[PDB]
Structure 1
Amino acid sequence: FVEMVDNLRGKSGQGYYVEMTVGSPPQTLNILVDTGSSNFAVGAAPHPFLHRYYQRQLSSTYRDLRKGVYVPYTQGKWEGELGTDLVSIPHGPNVTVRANIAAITESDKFFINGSNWEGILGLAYAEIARPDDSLEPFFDSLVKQTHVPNLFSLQLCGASEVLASVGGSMIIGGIDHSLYTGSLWYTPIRREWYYEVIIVRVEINGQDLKMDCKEYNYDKSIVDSGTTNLRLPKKVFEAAVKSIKAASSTEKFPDGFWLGEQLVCWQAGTTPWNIFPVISLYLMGEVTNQSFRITILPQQYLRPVEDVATSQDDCYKFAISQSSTGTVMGAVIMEGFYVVFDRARKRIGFAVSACHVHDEFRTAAVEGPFVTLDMEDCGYNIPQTDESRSHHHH
C-alpha cells in the first residue's frame, strides 16, 4: 500500500484531491475526494477557476451516453453531459476502469479559486447518485471490473501569501497498519446512501451535553471528506458553543469567531490550547448497548490561518458550524484519525492517525467500549415525502 501513501494534496479548507487520468490517451486531472456524493464529475469546459479541464474530443475511448446531469448542493451547483471513459488512479491500484463520467459544462459556486482540483470523486452509494441510482458510481465500477476488495480508507493530515498545504492518503482495497496506532473501532453504516453513522452521546470536557441522542442525528449524521468543518444541527451547535465558551471563559472572543466569520490571534507559539475543551463523539458500536468515543482536540476544531498582515501571530478559525442537513463529520474530525470505509462489511472504522496534530498534554483518542443499558434508538426517520414515495427500484 506504500504507492498509495501520500497520494492526497490540497490547500487548508479547500479539500483533499487525488490525481486521476481520464481517457485514451490519459488526460491528467486533480480530483476532490468526496464521501458525501456518488458522482464522478469533471470540468469539461472553460471556467475562470479551472487551470485545465477534460476534453472528450481527444479520447479514442470516450462514449457519449446522450443524457444530461444537474447536481445542486446546498453550497454549489454543477451540470453536464454524461458518458463513460477509461479512468485510472496513477498513485492508486494498478488498474484501468471503464467508468461513468459527468462532463461539467456549466457550474455555480462549485470550483474553488486555487483549490487545485478540476473534479469530484463521489465515493458514497448509488442511492444518492444523479440523475438516479442506476448510474453506477466509480467505486462500484472499480470493484465490479477488478479484484479490488470492497473497502477504502482515508488518512487526512492537517498542516503566508497562499493557504497552507495539506497531505494525506487514500488507500483503495485495504487497511495500512502503519497509518494508525491503537485499536480500530467500528460503527455500523446505518443505511447505504451517504456514509451514515449514529452518534449516541456528545461531551465537552467530560460534560455530557445531556440532549436526546436523536438530536445528534437530526436529520442525519454523515462522514464527509469534502466538508472542512464539523457541522452540527442548530440545537446541538448552540449547546456545543454554550459549553466551549464556558470552558474558554478566561479569554473573551467576538461573536464573529463562533460564527466562523473571524480569526483570533496569539503571539507565535503562545496559543493556550489548554483553555480549550475536547469534544468526544460517542458512536454506536458494532454490538448493541456498546459504543466508542472519538475524541477531538482544539488543534482540530480551530483551523490555523496565517494572515499576510498578522504574520507574527498564530491566527485561528473556529471550524465547528451550523447545519440544516444534519451532523457532518468533515476534515476537522477526520484529520485526527484513520477512517476505514468497510463497504464489504457495511461499517466505518476509526483509529488514531499516525499523522494527527497534538500537544504534550492531550491526544486525539479512539476509546471503547462504553455500555448503556436500555438505550433508545438515536437514529432519526426522515419524513417520507410524496416525491420519495413515488420512486421505483427493480
Structure 2
Amino acid sequence: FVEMVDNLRGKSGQGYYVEMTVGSPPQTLNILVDTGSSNFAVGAAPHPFLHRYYQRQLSSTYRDLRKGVYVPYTQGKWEGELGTDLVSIPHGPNVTVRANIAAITESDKFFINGSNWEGILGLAYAEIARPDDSLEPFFDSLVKQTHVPNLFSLQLCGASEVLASVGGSMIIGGIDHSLYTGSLWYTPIRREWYYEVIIVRVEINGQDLKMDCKEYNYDKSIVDSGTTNLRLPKKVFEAAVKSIKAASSTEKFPDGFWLGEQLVCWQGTTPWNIFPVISLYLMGEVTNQSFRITILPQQYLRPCYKFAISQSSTGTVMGAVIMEGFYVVFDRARKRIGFAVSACHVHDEFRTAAVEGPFVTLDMEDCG
C-alpha cells in the first residue's frame, strides 16, 4: 500500500483524481474518484476544458460495445459510446483489467475548467450504472479479474490566484494503518447502489437537533467523494444553520455566506473557536449501537472561506468536507463503511476531528 499513499490530487472544490491509463499503449489520464456514481467515463473527444482525452483509435486493445449511453441531469449532460479496453492505475495495485469505458463524445457542464481530470471513476454499485445495471462497474471488473480484495480505502486530506491543491490516498484492496489513528468504526451499507448509510442523530456543538431519525436520511444518505459539501435535507439543513448561526453569533455574516454562494475572510486570524463542531451519529453494526463522526469548522468552511454545508433535495450527501479528516473504508466485501480519524486532517490546538463509539440509540432500524 505504500505505493498508493498520496496517489490522489485535486483542486479544492473540483474533486480528487487518481492517475489512470487506458488502452495500448497506455494513455495517461486523470480520473475523478467518485463513490457517488458507478460509471468509468472518460472524455474521448476534444472539449474546451480537456487538455487530453481518450483516443480509441490509438488503442490496439480497444473493443467497441456498439452501444451508446446518454446521461442528462439538471445542469447539462454527457453522452458516450460504450467500449471496453485495458485499464490500470500506476499508483495502485500492479494489475491491468479489461473494463467498460464510456467514451464521452459530447457533453455540457460535465467537465470542469482547470480541475485537471479527464474522466470519472464511478466506484458505486451496478444498480445505478448507466445505461443500466448490466454495465459492470470498474471496481467489480477489478475484483472479478484480479486477486485484489473487494475493498478500498479513501483518505481525503483537503488542503493566490489558484484554488488550493488537495491531496489524498486511495488504497485499493486494503487498509493502510498508518493512514489513520484510533479505532475504525463501521456503519452498514444499507443497500448496494450508492454507498448508502444511516445517520441516527446529529448534534451541533454537543446539542442534539432532536429531529425524527428519518429526516436525517430523508430519501437517503450516502458517502460521496464526488461531492464537495456536506449536503443536508432541507429540514435538517435549516435546523443546522440556525444552530450554527447561534454558535457563531458573535460575528454576523451575509446570509449569501450561509447559502454557500459567498465567501469570507479574515487574514491565520480566523476565529475557528467561534464555530461549533458537527457530530453525525451513524448506525453501528449492532442494532442499538451507533458511533459519531465529529467535524470541525476547518472542514465545513472551505478556503477566504465558503460555507461548505448546503441544502439537498436528494438526501444527505457526506461529501469531501465530511470525508476529509477521516480515513474512510469502503468495505464492499462486508457491506460496511468504516471511519477512523485521519492521519491528516486540519485541526487546531483545542479541538480535533473525531470518531467515537459506541453510543446507544433506541430504534434506528427505522431511520431508513
TM-score class normalised by the smaller sequence: over 0.9
SS at match of 1:368: strand
After TM superposition, where is structure 1 displaced by more than 4 Å over at least 4 residues in a row?
none
Cα drift, residue 266 of structure 1: 1.0
In structure 2, C-alpha distance between the alignment counterparts of 1:3 and 1:375, rounded to whole Å? 40
After superposition, the C-alpha distances for 1:310-357 in whole angstroms (9 at most, x for unaligned) are xxxxx1100000111100000000001000000000000000000100
Cα drift, residue 240 of structure 1: 0.3
SS at match of 1:178: helix
Instruction: Report the identity percentage.
Output: 100
In structure 2, C-alpha distance between the alignment counterparts of 1:138 and 1:75, rounded to whole Å? 25
Cα drift, residue 73 of structure 1: 3.5
In structure 1, C-alpha distance between the alignment counterparts of 2:320 and 2:285, rounded to whole Å? 24
Q: How does 1:51-200 map to 2 (within 5 A)?
A: 51-200=51-200
Contact 2:213–2:364 (Cα < 8 Å) also in 1: no
SS at match of 2:130: coil
Partner of 1:222: 222
After superposition, the C-alpha distances for 1:230-262 in whole angstroms (9 at most, x for unaligned) are 000110000000000011111010110001111
In structure 1, C-alpha distance between the alignment counterparts of 2:27 and 2:258, rounded to whole Å? 43
| Structure 1 residues 150 and 107, CA gap change in structure 2 (3 angstroms) | same
In structure 1, C-alpha distance between the alignment counterparts of 2:72 and 2:56, rounded to whole Å? 23
Aligned pairs, how many?
Answer: 368
Partner of 2:283: 284
After superposition, the C-alpha distances for 1:338-382 in whole angstroms (9 at most, x for unaligned) are 000000000000000001000000000000001123456000xxx
Name stretches of at least 5 consecutive residues in structure 2 with no aligned partner: none
In structure 1, C-alpha distance between the alignment counterparts of 2:147 and 2:305, rounded to whole Å? 44
For structure 1, which segment, 134-143 or 72-81, has the greater mean C-alpha deviation from structure 2 after superposition?
72-81
Partner of 1:341: 330
SS at match of 1:156: strand
Cα drift, residue 70 of structure 1: 1.0
User: What TM-score, normalized by structure 1, do the two folds share?
Assistant: 0.92
In structure 2, C-alpha distance between the alignment counterparts of 1:78 and 1:349, rounded to whole Å? 32
RMSD between superposed Cα atoms in Å: 0.8
| Structure 1 residues 207 and 93, CA gap change in structure 2 (3 angstroms) | same
In structure 2, C-alpha distance between the alignment counterparts of 1:229 and 1:365, rounded to whole Å? 18
SS at match of 1:246: helix
In structure 2, C-alpha distance between the alignment counterparts of 1:373 and 1:72, rounded to whole Å? 41
SS at match of 1:333: helix
Cα drift, residue 74 of structure 1: 4.0
Cα drift, residue 151 of structure 1: 0.1
In structure 1, C-alpha distance between the alignment counterparts of 2:226 and 2:37, rounded to whole Å? 9
Cα drift, residue 158 of structure 1: 1.2
SS at match of 2:197: coil
Contact 2:41–2:104 (Cα < 8 Å) also in 1: yes
Cα drift, residue 12 of structure 1: 0.4
For structure 1, which segment, 156-165 or 167-176, has the greater mean C-alpha deviation from structure 2 after superposition?
156-165
| Structure 1 residues 132 and 250, CA gap change in structure 2 (3 angstroms) | same
Name stretches of at least 5 consecutive residues in structure 1 with no aligned partner: 305-314, 380-394
In structure 2, C-alpha distance between the alignment counterparts of 1:375 and 1:56, rounded to whole Å? 49
In structure 2, C-alpha distance between the alignment counterparts of 1:6 and 1:34, rounded to whole Å? 17
In structure 2, C-alpha distance between the alignment counterparts of 1:356 and 1:212, rounded to whole Å? 31
In structure 2, C-alpha distance between the alignment counterparts of 1:2 and 1:174, rounded to whole Å? 11
Contact 2:283–2:364 (Cα < 8 Å) also in 1: no
Partner of 2:366: 377
SS at match of 1:134: coil
Cα drift, residue 22 of structure 1: 0.2
In structure 1, C-alpha distance between the alignment counterparts of 2:340 and 2:48, rounded to whole Å? 40
Cα drift, residue 72 of structure 1: 2.5
Contact 2:287–2:365 (Cα < 8 Å) also in 1: no
SS at match of 1:141: helix
In structure 1, C-alpha distance between the alignment counterparts of 2:264 and 2:192, rounded to whole Å? 40
In structure 2, C-alpha distance between the alignment counterparts of 1:281 and 1:106, rounded to whole Å? 39
| Structure 1 residues 374 and 340, CA gap change in structure 2 (3 angstroms) | closer
In structure 1, C-alpha distance between the alignment counterparts of 2:112 and 2:363, rounded to whole Å? 47
Partner of 2:309: 320
| Structure 1 residues 56 and 273, CA gap change in structure 2 (3 angstroms) | same
SS at match of 2:95: coil
Cα drift, residue 77 of structure 1: 1.9
After superposition, the C-alpha distances for 1:82-119 in whole angstroms (9 at most, x for unaligned) are 00000000001000100000000011101000000000
In structure 1, C-alpha distance between the alignment counterparts of 2:162 and 2:348, rounded to whole Å? 26
